[PDB]
Nucleic acid binder design. Sequence first.
DNA 1: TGGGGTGTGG
Length: 293
Amino acid sequence: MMSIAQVRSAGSAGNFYTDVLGSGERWAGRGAEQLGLQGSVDKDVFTRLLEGRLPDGADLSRMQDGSNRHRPGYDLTFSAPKSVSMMAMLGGDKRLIDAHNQAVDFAVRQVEALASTRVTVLTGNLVMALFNHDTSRDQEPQLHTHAVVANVTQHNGEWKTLSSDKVGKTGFIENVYANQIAFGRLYREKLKEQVEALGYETEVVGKHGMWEMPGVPVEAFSGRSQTIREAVGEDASLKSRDVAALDTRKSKQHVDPEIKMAEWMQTLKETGFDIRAYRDAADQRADLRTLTP
DNA sequence: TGGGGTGTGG
Ligand SMILES: [Mg+2]
């Protein structure tokens, strides 16, 4: 599941991402490599990258009119299938938090192909920040990664701007939106490959091949989703659910990691699910094959 | 800026 969003403010939203299973926001992309950036994201260097102030001698901003300036960039959030989320946090399977991360690196890398600048020329490089979270605003397991793309790419010499000027030809983000499904798709496919290799089973449960591990009590950890549909309902348009997603949206919360982890384990019991039996069933499934043909 | 739900995203 890949969702999109425009970043419209540096300093402010620059923090947002700078802020419960062990807590890794790492850089990514050929562009982030050029500027010499690796698996760490300084609150300041990032907050800067959004204004147009690269680490390199590039200051592509527009600090005019008090505080009217550049265009920060975009947020491509890949959300993992609820069963994957649960198994990692409630099932303690750390191998999953990994698979998910590899699945994102794969996707985010296919997005970099569309990296192009205005003059339209595929510049094949991006400077990105990838933040990982594991809850929903409803406080449930909801592991996802905000692949924040900085509004900058590198053409021939200096850095330009992915974002466009005026209409001309569809620039970067235009194609991203035009290609959402494919991206959420191949992210989901990568996670899939690994997850099954670990010995887990999966079945389709939604459009464009969305899936989950069969048997895992998903319905019980989809509080946001349900609150959104109890409001605007089912059969509601995507746009209508966008607004619902925002109204009924609780505000960002300070949870007591162990009070919450316990509520989950507790609520997890009432479903009648045997977490342990599942991981083992998966192991035996994986073991059973790698030891045959 | 278009579009799948696990619903994130000043
Ligand atoms: Mg988040």
